[PDB]
Write a protein that binds this ligand. Structure first.
Ligand SMILES: Nc1ncnc2c1ncn2[C@@H]1O[C@H](COP(=O)(O)OP(=O)(O)O)[C@@H](O)[C@H]1O
Ligand SMILES: [Zn+2]
Lengths: 267, 4
C-alpha cells in the first residue's frame, strides 16, 4: 500500500464524507489497558477470559469487579493527540458542510471525551448498563457503580474475589424489574446490535474516504468494514504501528502511533 | 454478526 502523505492529503482535501474506524490502538496510546496483548492480564485472567457470556454466567461478581476496575481507571485517562485530531477534524469539516463519522470498537468513550459528536460505539460502553431481565440500557458513570464494589476490583495477582452475592451487584432500577445488570458491552461470541450495524452500513455505503486507525483487523465483523468501502473504489488509509492481515488491501499504510500520524493527516 |  502507498506510503505517501502527500497523496492522502489530496484525497482528504476533497472528501465530503469521511468514515474513521478506530480500534484499541487508539485507546492504548492513552494508556487504557486492553488486557488483550501477550502478558496483558487482570489478576490471573485476560479479557478473552472475562469478557464472555461464559464468565458472566459462572462468576458475575468477578466480571463486575473487572469492569468496575476498568471504569475506575478511566478517571486517570485522557484523550490523546489521535482522539483530539479526530475530534477537531469533525468540527472543522462540519462547519464546511462535510461529514466525519467515527466507528469505534473502543468502549472507553475517550472519543466522546475529546468532543467527537458523530460516533458509533459498535461494542458498547464501559459507562452503560443493560438489564439481563428487561433489556433496558442506561448510562451509568457512578463511582462505584454499587456500594458492594466500593474499593474492589484491585488488579494485583492474588487479590481475593469479592464474591458479591448477585443481589448486591448492580440492579435494574426500572419500576418493577430489579433484575441483574451487566455491562452494556459486546462480549466475544455475541452479536452486534443490528440497529447499530444498519447505521454503520449507511455510513460505509455513502462515504468517500475511509480511515482505519489502531485496529488489528482480526475482530469481526469490524474487520470487514473497510473492505466493503474499497470495493466501491473508495480510498482506505490504515494507521497502525504495524502491518495487519488486512494491510495489503488498503490504498495507504501509514506506519506508526496513531497520535503521531493522525494530526498530520487530518491537518 | 457475532464478535470474533
Ligand atoms: N499506538 C498505536 N497506534 C496505532 N496502532 C496501534 C497502537 N498500539 C497498538 N496498535 C495496534 O492496534 C491493534 C490492536 O489490536 P486489538 O487489541 O485486537 O484491537 P482491536 O480489537 O480494536 O482490533 C494492533 O494492530 C496493534 O498493533
Ligand atoms: Zn430490568
Amino acid at each position: 500500500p502507498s506510503s505517501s502523505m502527500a497523496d492522502f492529503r489530496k484525497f482528504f482535501a476533497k472528501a465530503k464524507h469521511i468514515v474513521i474506524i478506530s480500534g484499541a490502538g487508539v485507546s492504548a496510546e492513552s494508556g487504557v489497558p486492553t488486557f488483550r496483548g501477550a502478558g496483558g492480564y487482570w489478576r490471573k485472567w485476560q479479557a478473552q477470559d472475562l469478557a464472555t457470556p461464559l464468565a458472566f454466567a459462572h462468576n458475575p461478581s468477578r466480571v463486575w469487579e473487572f469492569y468496575h476496575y476498568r471504569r475506575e481507571v478511566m478517571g486517570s485517562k485522557e484523550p490523546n493527540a489521535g482522539h483530539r485530531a479526530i475530534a477537531e477534524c469533525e468540527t472543522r469539516l462540519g462547519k464546511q458542510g462535510r461529514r466525519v463519522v467515527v466507528i469505534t470498537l473502543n468502549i472507553d468513550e475517550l472519543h466522546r471525551k475529546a468532543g467527537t459528536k458523530n460516533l458509533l460505539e459498535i461494542h458498547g460502553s464501559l459507562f452503560k448498563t443493560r438489564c439481563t431481565s428487561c433489556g433496558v440500557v442506561a448510562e451509568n458513570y457512578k463511582s462505584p457503580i454499587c456500594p458492594a464494589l466500593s474499593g474492589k476490583g484491585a488488579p494485583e495477582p492474588g487479590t481475593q474475589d469479592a464474591s458479591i452475592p448477585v443481589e448486591k451487584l448492580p440492579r435494574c432500577e426500572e419500576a418493577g424489574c430489579g433484575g441483574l445488570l451487566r455491562p452494556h458491552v459486546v462480549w466475544f461470541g455475541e452479536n452486534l446490535d443490528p440497529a447499530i450495524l444498519e447505521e454503520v452500513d449507511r455510513e460505509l455505503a455513502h462515504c468517500d474516504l475511509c480511515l482505519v486507525v489502531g485496529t488489528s483487523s482480526v475482530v469481526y465483523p469490524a474487520a470487514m468494514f473497510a473492505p466493503q468501502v474499497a470495493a466501491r473504489g473508495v480510498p482506505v488509509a490504515e494507521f497502525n504501528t504495524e502491518t495487519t492481515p488486512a494491510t495489503n488491501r488498503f490504498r495507504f499504510h501509514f506506519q506508526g502511533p496513531c497520535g503521531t500520524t493522525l494530526p498530520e493527516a487530518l491537518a | 454478526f457475532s464478535k470474533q
